[PDB]
């Protein structure tokens, strides 16, 4: 009983990124060609061990059809059991705050045709995770990653969020706390997310805040945190599927008033569908980041192809 | 509806390479033990989507037995729709050239053991296509490739190719243009080859010349193109189908007198078929390139197997 | 008729390696996290050609959890016939050696939850090898690598074993010679490997000496050999199937007389058996190498997760 399962997608996009520099336009960076929006391809099977109670693995991979991917289980693969008790796995992990939200539904390589920018935190870790069942439309989840499996200038962290749907409704929530970080160091560090909507067919509508917090090392040791928002909206009309969405990041705090600049975008987009598997997708989008006077203001399109088998 | 295809291939293989240098013999090198031949194992699959339009796809790689390939999609993957107005596909993909002749029917890693010296121009790129249906015979091909998936010092390509077939009778055309290029530049450049031969069952016979050319970036702005022909011939006796294919390349063409040496090739064959999937073959090859004076000629030897499930 | 096999193993592990220096305690290096035991996935198929003649293939691969893994073909894979005559392959094969003994039942990434250190040198290669069919539980089997698959330092090995089995009873020979060797030389270098035991179900007990002969290119050319040995027993009651190995290593042998320290290693475990292809497993290490008076002693335990599909 195993099942060969997969994605393929590609299309053209094409993106434009124009800088200025508080008196005028500085350095604009076109940019057009053919992309692949994510592929993969993975094998997951189960057994039956009775009692209801059933072993689960998968092993997954980028399957880029540009041929730039290499590598076995580049994404999510495990083992695991599943049970009336719940489904414990192990191995490498999307994270939770990951599963949380579709913060981002679109496909897109570029960084302006999905809300990319919201999702940079969302990971996938060599982690153990508990999946809990449902109950009335409650279900939950928590992780832990070892210091050892993080690294030397890393340490665990720990994951946790909560599920909940009532026929159209639902709210998830996702957070992380991480003792230690480094980068090319912070502490202390924990986001959180909640995502809110409606989602019965024809109809889909959500949005959601993530909260960050760090505290950095600094000889001022001057606590950072930032905040961001999205909402996306999307109604079916027959086989096409309009949608879009938007997202804001307010200034970060720095020691103590905001110092860091905020970024606007906003996504519409449309699928066609062919079939339950094969549909069709067309993108444009807008981001402005950093302040007004002295900004970065970009913008794409793109068109694509997905097929899942 | 997917498919696991793929071909394993391999077998031991020789050879020596002798240097000349106006006067006698210069060094020798030989070598001698087993290669792989380019085993690979790829996945594709179609979805009917009504009215006659399906949706393909496919991912390709490499997987030579003695381990040394890595990465997915290496090969020839893409998605597309199929139809009655066509094939269009996008992705990574064989250029039309190299779908244009069996330059080399072989099966070989050593370039001595298939006509191999007149398909290094043979490429794959991402790139769209249009392929053709069929009327009479009647087939064609164009694809295009765009400069910012090519690269900064490259410049976009376009290939066409045509395609004809009166039951033994064939002929192809395939051509490339790009507008820039460059090595560790050139420029202007364009490939044309056309073969045409016999090939029902019991009978392959063909032949096709293959013309380059590009203008040198010199200060002196020097024209130059490099030609090159190939006959293959073979016929198949109960289960026994000995071939045979010849090569030469003309000098090449610099500024205005053919300055460059020209390279003359044959190779002799035979394949055993186990079934109409596993083949096993035996090749000798023979190669002298350049001038007759101080040049280079060298040998080899390979036997295989293949299967191709 | 093609097959998609594979193994899915990972788990906890932790280790402490204490080191001492003629005198008292010098360094201890703890660690504790999440590894993955070796998981593969491979395809392999046959095709019947008849009169009993049979043709196969195989590609098989690392399939790392954690991600770490890449490339096709990275293990055991092939291409070769089958037959009442035998069975031949070539490609990338494990080492007659290797098949030898189950010296390592364990699964287990760490160096101390199996008896890895008689293992090292066990190897796959790009070789030959002729398998021979049993007659009376007789079976045979030899191999070789050329020069230039081992390469410009090493020369080629020659590798021959036999089997023997009469009900429980069992024995098996393994050996490899190799011209010439490098590391970062040595010359004529043997190894012959034997174990015997009782493996009818319900009882399992093995032992198995290995000695390694090697001459150092030393300007004093001094020869050198290792031997080392190994006893694992286990017996299944039920579904549940405790084992324990243990492992020697006498002195090297150098110039003359002993010069080099011996370890001594010793592995206790369970598995529990959900099916017969899903398996959980528990275990716990002890080595301590080099002399008693200045060593290094190390311990782990390791928890698992099997499946194989």
């Known amino acids: 009983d195993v099942t060969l399962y997969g994605t393929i997608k590609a299309g053209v996009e ?13 350095e604009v960076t076109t940019a057009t060609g053919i992309v692949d929006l994510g592929s993969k391809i993975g ?30 289980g580049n994404r999510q693969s495990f083992i695991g059991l599943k049970g009336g008790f719940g489904k414990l796995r192990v191995g490498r992990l999307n994270s939770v705050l990951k599963d949380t939200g579709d913060i981002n539904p679109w496909d897109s390589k570029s960084d302006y045709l999905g809300v990319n920018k919201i999702a940079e935190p969302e990971a996938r870790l060599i982690s ?14 928590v992780q832990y990653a070892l210091n050892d499996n993080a690294g030397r200038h890393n340490s665990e962290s720990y994951h946790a969020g909560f599920n909940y749907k009532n026929g159209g409704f639902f709210v998830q929530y996702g957070g992380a706390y991480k003792r230690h970080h480094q980068v090319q160091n912070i502490e202390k560090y924990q986001i ?10 024809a109809l889909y509508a959500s949005v959601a805040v993530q909260q960050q917090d760090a505290k950095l090392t600094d000889a001022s040791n001057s606590h950072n945190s930032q905040t961001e928002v999205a909402a996306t909206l999307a109604y079916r009309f027959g086989n096409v599927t309009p949608r879009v969405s938007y997202a804001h990041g307010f200034k970060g705090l720095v020691d103590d008033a905001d110092i860091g600049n905020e970024y606007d975008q906003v996504v519409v987009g449309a699928e066609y569908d062919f079939s339950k598997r094969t549909s069709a997708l067309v993108s444009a989008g807008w981001l402005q980041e950093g302040k007004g006077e002295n900004k970065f203001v970009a913008t794409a399109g793109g068109v694509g192809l997905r097929h899942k088998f």
């Open 14 to 26: 094409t993106s434009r990124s124009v800088f200025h520099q508080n008196g005028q336009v500085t």
């Open 43 to 72: 094998f997951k099977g189960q057994e039956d061990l009775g009692n209801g109670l059933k072993a689960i693995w998968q092993v997954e991979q980028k399957a880029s059809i540009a041929g730039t991917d290499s590598g076995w």
């Open 128 to 141: 153990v995770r508990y999946d809990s069942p449902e109950f009335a439309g409650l279900s939950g989840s």
């Open 192 to 201: 959180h997310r909640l995502v809110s909507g409606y989602d019965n067919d």
